[PDB]
Short mmCIF file of C-alpha atoms in Angstrom, two decimals:
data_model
loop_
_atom_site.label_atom_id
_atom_site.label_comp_id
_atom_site.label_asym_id
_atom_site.label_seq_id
_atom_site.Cartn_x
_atom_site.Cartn_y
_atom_site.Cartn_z
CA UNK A 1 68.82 88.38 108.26
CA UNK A 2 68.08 91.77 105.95
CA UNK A 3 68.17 94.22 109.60
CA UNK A 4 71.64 92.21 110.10
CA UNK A 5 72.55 93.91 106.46
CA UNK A 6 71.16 97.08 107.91
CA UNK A 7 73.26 96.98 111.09
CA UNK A 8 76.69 97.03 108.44
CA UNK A 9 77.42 99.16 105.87
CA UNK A 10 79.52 98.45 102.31
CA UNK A 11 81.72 100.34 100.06
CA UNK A 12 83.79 98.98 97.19
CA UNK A 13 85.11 102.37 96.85
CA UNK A 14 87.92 101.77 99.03
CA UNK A 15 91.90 102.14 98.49
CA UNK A 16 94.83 101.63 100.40
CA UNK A 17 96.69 104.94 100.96
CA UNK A 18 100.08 105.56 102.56
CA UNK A 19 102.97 108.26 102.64
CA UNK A 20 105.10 109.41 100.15
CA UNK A 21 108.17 111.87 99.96
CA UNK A 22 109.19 114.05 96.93
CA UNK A 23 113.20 114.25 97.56
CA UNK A 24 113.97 117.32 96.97
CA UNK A 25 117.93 119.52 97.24
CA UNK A 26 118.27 122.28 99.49
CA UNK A 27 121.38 123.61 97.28
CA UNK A 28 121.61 124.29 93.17
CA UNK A 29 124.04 122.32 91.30
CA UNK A 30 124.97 119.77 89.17
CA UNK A 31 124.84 116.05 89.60
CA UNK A 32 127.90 113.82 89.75
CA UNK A 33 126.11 110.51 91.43
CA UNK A 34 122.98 108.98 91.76
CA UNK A 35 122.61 106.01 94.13
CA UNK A 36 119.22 104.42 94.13
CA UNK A 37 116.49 103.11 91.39
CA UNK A 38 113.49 102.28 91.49
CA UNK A 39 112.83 99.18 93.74
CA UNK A 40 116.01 99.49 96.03
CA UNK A 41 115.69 99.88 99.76
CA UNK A 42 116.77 102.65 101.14
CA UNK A 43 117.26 103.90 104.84
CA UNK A 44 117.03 106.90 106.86
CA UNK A 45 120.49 108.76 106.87
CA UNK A 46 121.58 107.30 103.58
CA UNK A 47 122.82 109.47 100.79
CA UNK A 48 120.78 109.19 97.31
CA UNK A 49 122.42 112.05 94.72
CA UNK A 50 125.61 113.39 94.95
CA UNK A 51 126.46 116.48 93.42
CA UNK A 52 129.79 118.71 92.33
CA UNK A 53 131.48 120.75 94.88
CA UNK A 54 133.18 123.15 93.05
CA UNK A 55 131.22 126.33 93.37
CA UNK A 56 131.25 125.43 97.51
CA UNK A 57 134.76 125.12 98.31
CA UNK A 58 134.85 128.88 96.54
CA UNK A 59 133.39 130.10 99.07
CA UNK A 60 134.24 128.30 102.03
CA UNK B 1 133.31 136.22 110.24
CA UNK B 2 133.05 132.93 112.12
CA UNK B 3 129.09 133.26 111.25
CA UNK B 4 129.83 133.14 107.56
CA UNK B 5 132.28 130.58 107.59
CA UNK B 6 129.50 127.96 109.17
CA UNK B 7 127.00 129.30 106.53
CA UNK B 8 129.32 128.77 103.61
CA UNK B 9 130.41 125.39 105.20
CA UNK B 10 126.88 124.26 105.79
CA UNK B 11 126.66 125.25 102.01
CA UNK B 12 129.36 122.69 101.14
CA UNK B 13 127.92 119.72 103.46
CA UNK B 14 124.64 120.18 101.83
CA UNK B 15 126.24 118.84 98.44
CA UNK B 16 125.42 115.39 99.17
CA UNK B 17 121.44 114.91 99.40
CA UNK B 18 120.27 112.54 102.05
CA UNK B 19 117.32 110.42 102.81
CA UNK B 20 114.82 111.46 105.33
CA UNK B 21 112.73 108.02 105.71
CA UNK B 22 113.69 104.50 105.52
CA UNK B 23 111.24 103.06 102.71
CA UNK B 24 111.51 101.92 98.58
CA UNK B 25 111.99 104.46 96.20
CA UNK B 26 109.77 104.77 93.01
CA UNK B 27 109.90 107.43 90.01
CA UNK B 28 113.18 108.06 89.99
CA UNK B 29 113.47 111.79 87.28
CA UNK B 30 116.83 112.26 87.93
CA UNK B 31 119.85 111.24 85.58
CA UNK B 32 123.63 112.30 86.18
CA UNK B 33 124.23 115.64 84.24
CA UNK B 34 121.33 117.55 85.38
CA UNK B 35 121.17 120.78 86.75
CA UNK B 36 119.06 121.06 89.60
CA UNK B 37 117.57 123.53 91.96
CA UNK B 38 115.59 122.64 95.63
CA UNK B 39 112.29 123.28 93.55
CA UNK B 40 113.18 120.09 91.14
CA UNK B 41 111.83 116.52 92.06
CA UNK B 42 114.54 114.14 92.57
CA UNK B 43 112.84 110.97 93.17
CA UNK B 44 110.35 109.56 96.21
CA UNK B 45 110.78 107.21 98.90
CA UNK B 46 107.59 105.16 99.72
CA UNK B 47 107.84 103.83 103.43
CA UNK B 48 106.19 100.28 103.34
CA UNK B 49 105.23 100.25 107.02
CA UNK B 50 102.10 102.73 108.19
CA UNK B 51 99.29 102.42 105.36
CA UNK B 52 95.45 103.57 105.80
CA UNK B 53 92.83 103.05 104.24
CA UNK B 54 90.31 105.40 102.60
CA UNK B 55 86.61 104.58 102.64
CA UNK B 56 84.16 106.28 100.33
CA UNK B 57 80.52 106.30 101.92
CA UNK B 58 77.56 108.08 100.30
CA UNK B 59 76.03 110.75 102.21
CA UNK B 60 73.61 108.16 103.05
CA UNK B 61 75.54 105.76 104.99
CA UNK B 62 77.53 108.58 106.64
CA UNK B 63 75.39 108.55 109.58
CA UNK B 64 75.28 105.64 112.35
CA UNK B 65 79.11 105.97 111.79
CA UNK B 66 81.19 106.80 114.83
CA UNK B 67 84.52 106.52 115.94
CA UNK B 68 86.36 103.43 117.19
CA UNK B 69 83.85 100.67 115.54
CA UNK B 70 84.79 97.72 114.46
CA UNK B 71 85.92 96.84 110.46
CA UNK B 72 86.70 94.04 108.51
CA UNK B 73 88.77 94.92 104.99
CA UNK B 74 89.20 92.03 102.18
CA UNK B 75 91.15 92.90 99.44
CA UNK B 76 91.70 91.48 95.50
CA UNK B 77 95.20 90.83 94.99
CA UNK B 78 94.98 88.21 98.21
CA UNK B 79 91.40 87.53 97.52
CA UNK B 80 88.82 86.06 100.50
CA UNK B 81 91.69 83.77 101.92
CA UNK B 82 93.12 86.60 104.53
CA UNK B 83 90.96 88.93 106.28
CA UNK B 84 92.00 92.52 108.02
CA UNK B 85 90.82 94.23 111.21
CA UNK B 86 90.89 97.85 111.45
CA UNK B 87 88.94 100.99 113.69
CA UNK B 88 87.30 104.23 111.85
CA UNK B 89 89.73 106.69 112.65
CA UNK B 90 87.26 109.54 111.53
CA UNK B 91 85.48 111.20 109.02
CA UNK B 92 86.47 114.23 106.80
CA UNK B 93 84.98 117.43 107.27
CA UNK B 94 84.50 117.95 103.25
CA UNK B 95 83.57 116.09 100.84
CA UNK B 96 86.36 116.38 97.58
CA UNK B 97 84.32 119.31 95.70
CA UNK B 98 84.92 121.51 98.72
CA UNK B 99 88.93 121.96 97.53
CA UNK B 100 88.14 121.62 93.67
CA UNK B 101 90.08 123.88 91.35
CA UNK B 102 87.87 123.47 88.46
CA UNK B 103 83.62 123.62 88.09
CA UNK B 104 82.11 120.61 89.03
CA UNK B 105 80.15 120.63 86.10
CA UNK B 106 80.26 122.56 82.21
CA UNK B 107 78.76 126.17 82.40
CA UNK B 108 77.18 125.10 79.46
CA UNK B 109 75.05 122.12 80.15
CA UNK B 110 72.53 122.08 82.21
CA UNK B 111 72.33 121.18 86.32
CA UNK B 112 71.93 117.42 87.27
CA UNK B 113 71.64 116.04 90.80
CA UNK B 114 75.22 113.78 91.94
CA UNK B 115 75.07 112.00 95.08
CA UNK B 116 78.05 112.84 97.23
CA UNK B 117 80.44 110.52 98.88
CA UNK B 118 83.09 111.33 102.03
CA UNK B 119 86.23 109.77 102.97
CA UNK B 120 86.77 107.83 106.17
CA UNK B 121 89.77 106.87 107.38
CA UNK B 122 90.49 103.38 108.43
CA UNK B 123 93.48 102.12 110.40
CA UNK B 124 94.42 98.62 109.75
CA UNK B 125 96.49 96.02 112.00
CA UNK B 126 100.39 96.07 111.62
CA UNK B 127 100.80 92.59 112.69
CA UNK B 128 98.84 91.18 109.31
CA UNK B 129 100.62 94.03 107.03
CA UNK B 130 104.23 92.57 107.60
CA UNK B 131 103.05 88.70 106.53
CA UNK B 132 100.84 90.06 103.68
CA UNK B 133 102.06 93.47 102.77
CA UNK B 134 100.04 95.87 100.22
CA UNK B 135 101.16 98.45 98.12
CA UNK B 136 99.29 102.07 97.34
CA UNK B 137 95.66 102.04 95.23
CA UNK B 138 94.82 98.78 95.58
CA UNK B 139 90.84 97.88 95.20
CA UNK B 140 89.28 96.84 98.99
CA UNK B 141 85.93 95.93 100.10
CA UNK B 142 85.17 97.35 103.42
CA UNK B 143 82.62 96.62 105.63
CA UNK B 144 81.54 98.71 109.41
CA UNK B 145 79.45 97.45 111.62
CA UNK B 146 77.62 99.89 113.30
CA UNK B 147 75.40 98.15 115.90
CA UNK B 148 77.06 100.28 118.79
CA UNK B 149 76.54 104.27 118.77
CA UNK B 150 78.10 106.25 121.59
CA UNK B 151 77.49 109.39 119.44
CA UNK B 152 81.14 110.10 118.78
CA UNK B 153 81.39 111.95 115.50
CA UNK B 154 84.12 114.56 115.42
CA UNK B 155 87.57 113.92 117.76
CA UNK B 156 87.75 116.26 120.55
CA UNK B 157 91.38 114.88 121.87
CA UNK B 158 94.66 116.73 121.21
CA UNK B 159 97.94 114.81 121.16
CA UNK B 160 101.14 116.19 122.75
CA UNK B 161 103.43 113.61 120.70
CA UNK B 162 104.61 114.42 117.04
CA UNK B 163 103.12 112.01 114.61
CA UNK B 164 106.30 111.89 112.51
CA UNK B 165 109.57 113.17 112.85
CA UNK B 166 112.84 112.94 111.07
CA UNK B 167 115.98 114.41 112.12
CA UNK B 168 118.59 112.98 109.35
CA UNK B 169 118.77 116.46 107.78
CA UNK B 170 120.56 117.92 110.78
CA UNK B 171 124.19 118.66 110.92
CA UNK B 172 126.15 119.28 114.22
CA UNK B 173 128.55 122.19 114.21
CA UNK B 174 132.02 120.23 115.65
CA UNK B 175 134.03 119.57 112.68
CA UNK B 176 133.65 123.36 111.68
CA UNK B 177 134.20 125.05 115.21
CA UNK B 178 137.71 122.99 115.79
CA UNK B 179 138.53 124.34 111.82
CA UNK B 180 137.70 127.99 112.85
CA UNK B 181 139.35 127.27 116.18
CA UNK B 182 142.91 126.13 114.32
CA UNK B 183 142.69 129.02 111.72
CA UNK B 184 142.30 131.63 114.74
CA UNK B 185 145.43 129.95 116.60
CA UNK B 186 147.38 130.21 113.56
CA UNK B 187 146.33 133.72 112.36
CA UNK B 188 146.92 135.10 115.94
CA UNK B 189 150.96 135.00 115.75
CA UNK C 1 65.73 123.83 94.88
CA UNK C 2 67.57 120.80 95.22
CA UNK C 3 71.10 122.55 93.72
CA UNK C 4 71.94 123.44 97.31
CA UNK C 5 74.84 122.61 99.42
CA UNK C 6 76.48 123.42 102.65
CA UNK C 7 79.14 125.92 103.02
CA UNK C 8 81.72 127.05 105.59
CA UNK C 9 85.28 128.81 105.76
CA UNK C 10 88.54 126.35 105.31
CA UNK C 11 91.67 127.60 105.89
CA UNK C 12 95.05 126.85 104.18
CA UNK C 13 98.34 126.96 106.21
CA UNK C 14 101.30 128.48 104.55
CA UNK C 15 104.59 129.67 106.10
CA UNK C 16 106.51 132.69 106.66
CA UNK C 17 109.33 131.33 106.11
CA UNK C 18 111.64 129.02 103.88
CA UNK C 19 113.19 125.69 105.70
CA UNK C 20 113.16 122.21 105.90
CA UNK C 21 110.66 120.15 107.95
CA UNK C 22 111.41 118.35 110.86
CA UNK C 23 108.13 117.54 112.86
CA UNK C 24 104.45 117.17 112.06
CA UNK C 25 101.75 117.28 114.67
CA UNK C 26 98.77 116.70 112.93
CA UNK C 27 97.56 114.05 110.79
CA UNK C 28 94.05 113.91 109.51
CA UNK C 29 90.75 114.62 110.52
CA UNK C 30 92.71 115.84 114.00
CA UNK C 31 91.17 117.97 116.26
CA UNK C 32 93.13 121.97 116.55
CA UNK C 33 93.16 124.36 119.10
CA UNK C 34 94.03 127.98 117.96
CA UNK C 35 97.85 129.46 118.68
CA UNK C 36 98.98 125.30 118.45
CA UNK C 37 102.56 124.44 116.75
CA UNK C 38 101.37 122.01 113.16
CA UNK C 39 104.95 122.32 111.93
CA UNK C 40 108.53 122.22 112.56
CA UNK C 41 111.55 123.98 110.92
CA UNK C 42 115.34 123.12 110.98
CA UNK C 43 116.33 126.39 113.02
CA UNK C 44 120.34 126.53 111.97
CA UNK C 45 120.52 128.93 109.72
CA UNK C 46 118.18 131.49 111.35
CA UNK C 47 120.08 131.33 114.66
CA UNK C 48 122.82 132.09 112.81
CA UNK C 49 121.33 134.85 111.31
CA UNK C 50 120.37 135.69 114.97
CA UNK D 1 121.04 147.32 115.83
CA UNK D 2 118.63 146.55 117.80
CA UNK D 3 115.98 146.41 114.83
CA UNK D 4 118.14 144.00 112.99
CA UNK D 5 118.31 141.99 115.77
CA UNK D 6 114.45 142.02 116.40
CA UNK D 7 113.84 141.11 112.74
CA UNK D 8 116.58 137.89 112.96
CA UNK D 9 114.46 136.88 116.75
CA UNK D 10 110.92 136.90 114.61
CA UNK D 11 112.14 135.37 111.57
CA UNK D 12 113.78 132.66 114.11
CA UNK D 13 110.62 132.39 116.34
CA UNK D 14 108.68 131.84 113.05
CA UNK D 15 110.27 128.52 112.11
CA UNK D 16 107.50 127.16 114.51
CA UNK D 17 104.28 127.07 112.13
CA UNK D 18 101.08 127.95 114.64
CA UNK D 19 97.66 127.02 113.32
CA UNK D 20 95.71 130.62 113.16
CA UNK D 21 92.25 129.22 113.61
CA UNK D 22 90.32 126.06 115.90
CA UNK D 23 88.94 123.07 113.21
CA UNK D 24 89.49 119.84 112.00
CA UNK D 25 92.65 119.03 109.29
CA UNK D 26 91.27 117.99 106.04
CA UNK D 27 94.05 117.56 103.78
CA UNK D 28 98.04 116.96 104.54
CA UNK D 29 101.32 117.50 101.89
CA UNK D 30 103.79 117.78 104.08
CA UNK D 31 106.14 115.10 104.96
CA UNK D 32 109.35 115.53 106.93
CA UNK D 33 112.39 116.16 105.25
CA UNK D 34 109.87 118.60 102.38
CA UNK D 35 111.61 121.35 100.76
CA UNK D 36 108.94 124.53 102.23
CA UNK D 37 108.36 128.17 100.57
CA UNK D 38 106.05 130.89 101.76
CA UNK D 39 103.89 129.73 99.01
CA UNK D 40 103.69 125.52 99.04
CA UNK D 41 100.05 124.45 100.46
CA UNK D 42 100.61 122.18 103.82
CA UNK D 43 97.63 121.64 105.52
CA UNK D 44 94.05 122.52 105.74
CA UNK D 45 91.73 123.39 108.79
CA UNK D 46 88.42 123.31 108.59
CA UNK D 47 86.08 124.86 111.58
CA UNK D 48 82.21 123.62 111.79
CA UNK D 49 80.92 126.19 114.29
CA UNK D 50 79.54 128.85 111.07
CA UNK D 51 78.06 127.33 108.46
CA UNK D 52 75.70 127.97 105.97
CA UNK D 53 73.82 126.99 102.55
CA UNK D 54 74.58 128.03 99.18
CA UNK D 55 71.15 127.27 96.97
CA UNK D 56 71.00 127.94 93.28
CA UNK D 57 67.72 129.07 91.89
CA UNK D 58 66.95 129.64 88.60
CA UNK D 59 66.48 132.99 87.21
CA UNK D 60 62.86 132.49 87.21
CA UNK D 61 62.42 131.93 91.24
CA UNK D 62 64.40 135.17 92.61
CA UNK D 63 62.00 137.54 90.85
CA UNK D 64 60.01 137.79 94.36
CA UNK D 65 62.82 136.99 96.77
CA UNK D 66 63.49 139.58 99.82
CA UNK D 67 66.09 139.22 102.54
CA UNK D 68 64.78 138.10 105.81
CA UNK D 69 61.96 135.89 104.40
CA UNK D 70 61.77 131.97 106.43
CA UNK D 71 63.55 129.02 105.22
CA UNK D 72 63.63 125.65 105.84
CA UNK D 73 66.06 122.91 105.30
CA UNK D 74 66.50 119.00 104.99
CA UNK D 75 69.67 117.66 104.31
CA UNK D 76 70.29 114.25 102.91
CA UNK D 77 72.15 112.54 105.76
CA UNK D 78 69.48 112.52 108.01
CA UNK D 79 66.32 112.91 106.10
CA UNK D 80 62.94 114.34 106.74
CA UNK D 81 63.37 113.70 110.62
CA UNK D 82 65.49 116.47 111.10
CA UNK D 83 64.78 119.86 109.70
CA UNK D 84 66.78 123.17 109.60
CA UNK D 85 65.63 126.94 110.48
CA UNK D 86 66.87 129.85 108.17
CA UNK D 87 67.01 132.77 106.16
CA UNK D 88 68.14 134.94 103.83
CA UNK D 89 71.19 137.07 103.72
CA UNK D 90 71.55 138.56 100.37
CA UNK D 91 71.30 138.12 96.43
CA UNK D 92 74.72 137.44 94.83
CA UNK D 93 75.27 140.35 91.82
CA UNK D 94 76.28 137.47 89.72
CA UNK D 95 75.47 134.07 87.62
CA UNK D 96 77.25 131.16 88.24
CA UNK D 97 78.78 130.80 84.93
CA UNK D 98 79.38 134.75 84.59
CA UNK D 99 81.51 134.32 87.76
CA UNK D 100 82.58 130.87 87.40
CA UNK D 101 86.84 130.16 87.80
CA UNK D 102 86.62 129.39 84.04
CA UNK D 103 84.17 131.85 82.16
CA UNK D 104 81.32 130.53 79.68
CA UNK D 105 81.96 131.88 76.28
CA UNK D 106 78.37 132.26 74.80
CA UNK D 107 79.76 134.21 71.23
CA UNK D 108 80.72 130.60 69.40
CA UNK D 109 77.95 130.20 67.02
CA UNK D 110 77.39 126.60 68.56
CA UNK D 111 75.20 128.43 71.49
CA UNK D 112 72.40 126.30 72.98
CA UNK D 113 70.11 128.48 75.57
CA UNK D 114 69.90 127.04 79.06
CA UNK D 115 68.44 128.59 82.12
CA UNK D 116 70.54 130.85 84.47
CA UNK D 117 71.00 129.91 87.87
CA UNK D 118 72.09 132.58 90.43
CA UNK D 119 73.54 131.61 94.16
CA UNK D 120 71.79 132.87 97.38
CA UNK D 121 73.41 132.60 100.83
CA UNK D 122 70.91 131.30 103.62
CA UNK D 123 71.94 131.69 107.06
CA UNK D 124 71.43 128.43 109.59
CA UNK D 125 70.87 128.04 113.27
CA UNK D 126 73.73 127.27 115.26
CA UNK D 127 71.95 126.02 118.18
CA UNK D 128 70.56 122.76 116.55
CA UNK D 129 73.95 122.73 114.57
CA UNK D 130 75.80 121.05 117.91
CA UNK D 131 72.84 118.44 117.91
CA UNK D 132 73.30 117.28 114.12
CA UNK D 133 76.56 118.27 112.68
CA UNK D 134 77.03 119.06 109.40
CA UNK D 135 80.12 118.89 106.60
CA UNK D 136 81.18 120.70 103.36
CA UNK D 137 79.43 119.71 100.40
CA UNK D 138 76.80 117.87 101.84
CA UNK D 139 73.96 118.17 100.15
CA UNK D 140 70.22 119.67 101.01
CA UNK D 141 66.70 120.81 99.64
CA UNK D 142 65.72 124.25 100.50
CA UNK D 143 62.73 125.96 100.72
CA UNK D 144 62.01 130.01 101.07
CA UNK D 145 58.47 131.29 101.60
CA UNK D 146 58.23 134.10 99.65
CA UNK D 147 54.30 134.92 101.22
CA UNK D 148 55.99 138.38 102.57
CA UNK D 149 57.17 140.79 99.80
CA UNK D 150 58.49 144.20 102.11
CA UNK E 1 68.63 137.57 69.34
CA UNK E 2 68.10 135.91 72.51
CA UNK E 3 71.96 135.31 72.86
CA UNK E 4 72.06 138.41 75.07
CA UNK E 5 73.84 139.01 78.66
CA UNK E 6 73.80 141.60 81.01
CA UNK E 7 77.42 143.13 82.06
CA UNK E 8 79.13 145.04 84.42
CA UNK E 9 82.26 146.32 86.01
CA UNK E 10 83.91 144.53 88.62
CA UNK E 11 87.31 144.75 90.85
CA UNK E 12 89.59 142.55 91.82
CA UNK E 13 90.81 144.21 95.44
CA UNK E 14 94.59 143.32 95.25
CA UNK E 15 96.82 144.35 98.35
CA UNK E 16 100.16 147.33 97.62
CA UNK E 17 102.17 145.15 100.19
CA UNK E 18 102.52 141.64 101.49
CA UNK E 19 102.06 140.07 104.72
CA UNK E 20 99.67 138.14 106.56
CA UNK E 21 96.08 138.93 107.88
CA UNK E 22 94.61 139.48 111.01
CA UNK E 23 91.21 140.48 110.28
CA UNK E 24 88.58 140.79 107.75
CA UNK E 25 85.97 142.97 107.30
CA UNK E 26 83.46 141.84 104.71
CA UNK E 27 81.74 138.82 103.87
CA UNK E 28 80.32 137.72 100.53
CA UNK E 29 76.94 140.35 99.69
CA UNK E 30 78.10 142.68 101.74
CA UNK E 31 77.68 146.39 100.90
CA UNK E 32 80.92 148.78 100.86
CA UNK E 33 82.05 152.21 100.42
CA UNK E 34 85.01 154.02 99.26
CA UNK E 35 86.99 154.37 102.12
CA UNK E 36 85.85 151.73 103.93
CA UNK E 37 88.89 149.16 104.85
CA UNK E 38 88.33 145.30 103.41
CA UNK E 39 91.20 143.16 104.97
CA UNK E 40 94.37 144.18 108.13
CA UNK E 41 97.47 142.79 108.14
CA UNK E 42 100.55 142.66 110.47
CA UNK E 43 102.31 145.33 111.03
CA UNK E 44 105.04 144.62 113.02
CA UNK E 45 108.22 144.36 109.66
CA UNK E 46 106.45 147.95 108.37
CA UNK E 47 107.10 149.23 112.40
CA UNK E 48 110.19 148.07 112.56
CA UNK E 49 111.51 149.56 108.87
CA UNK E 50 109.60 152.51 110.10
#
């Protein structure tokens, strides 16, 4: 009845939590396309920015 | 040479930027026109499909609380009419202040006692998350029953198995070998 | 006094290197053994190197 | 050569990030697909073998304090049921706010005086550590007998 | 006045080279001399430029 209490404890400080990934480039550039906003689903292996290849087919 | 010409090719792939995880995306700070560097945020991508909970206890419920027992989560936007079943995954081995950058409290003023709290991490059922999804921050009550104590505290068990793992970010090496492969047969006479 | 806590060594892990993940093996509140792998790195352009 | 080629092998053998020390992780900002310099936090590991208590006194309780001298702690999470063996290990050479991450700037004109608090390290049994672990930032009442002044 | 402070000098050890360390040799209130080494890194890059 009040030792039942006792046998659970209570927290309202609670908050769902989850994973999150800051998209980042691994080159320097300039972008030409951008192909998500916020609220669109988006899957592994899909491309998101697009940028100008210029200064890359220089060098290659 | 051949080295160099996969490095600068590698380069040019790179020019499109592609998505490591299958999720939503949210805060999206980039706009065509911008110059960009790999130390510039782009955007996030919020996978909808493993989500926690984290439990703050005082100090003074932190005891009698072991791993494996039995929860029971209700949350606001769904109110009391669904319910959610979870485990305690574990407790933290600090308490928030431990990592702080700043003093917890003014120089100036004086001292005055705070009780602490510490994180526990709750693991909820993925069979009620797909019917009645939630989203990050959301206000929970929790409730542990701790009637059962075995007098398992800290996890002992490592895991050979990767916990995540994402391999859209590799590029195989064919297109480029047959290139360097033509340019030698026609360079060679 | 009351104004006293409890105090220990933590340890952040940083790399030697510059890449791009691939692999995590730890979570949270996961148990570590000393000399275990916590992160992977896409190895391409460091074989090359090689 | 052969040194440029041992320098490639260890800078390819250290794409494989090795955890230097046994603990528990605490904190994780690393997802796959992150952008990683020799400088970006990832993880945290936090051991509970050594651990000890950091008490503040004011500057008006260290004037007879000596290192070696008993001390005796309760933490919170368990209560007066389970006490704690200890002692000193040394004085800090500094106040709190003199050595504080942000520094107290006392030359403002707007100065109210408040008592100085200085830390002092206390050293903790092990043994009855295993029994009753114990986390960072918990918190606890100490206690020094200060009977023995040599 | 009783706005007064006691000062001193203090130093923070900074290392002439980078790497990463293998051992430590002092803990906080610990007493230290002149020549007496604080913190060991790797040497294996330094052996190898050597």
């Amino acid at each position: 009845w009040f030792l039942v209490l006792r046998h659970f404890e209570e927290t309202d400080d609670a908050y769902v939590a989850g994973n999150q990934i800051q998209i980042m480039s691994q080159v320097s550039g300039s972008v030409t396309k951008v192909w998500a906003d916020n609220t669109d689903f988006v899957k592994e292996g899909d491309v998101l920015v697009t940028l100008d290849p210029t200064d890359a087919r220089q060098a290659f | 040479a051949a080295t160099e010409v996969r490095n600068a090719w590698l380069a040019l792939e790179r020019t499109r930027i592609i998505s490591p995880m299958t999720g939503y995306v949210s805060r999206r700070a980039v706009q065509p026109g911008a110059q960009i560097s790999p130390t510039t945020p782009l955007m996030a991508v919020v996978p909808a499909t493993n989500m926690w909970v984290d439990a703050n206890f005082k100090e003074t419920q932190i005891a009698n609380m072991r791993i494996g027992q039995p929860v029971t989560i209700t949350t606001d936007i769904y109110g009391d009419d669904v319910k959610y079943t979870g485990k305690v995954v574990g407790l933290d081995m600090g308490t928030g202040s431990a990592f702080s950058l700043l003093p917890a409290q003014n120089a100036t003023g004086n001292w005055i006692k705070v009780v602490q709290r510490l994180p526990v991490r709750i693991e909820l059922d993925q069979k009620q998350l797909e019917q009645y999804p939630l989203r990050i921050g959301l206000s929970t009550l929790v409730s542990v029953n701790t009637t059962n104590r075995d007098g398992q505290v800290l996890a002992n068990k490592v895991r050979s198995t990767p916990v995540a793992v994402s391999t859209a970010r590799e590029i195989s090496l064919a297109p480029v070998n047959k290139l360097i492969d033509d340019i030698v047969k026609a360079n060679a006479g």
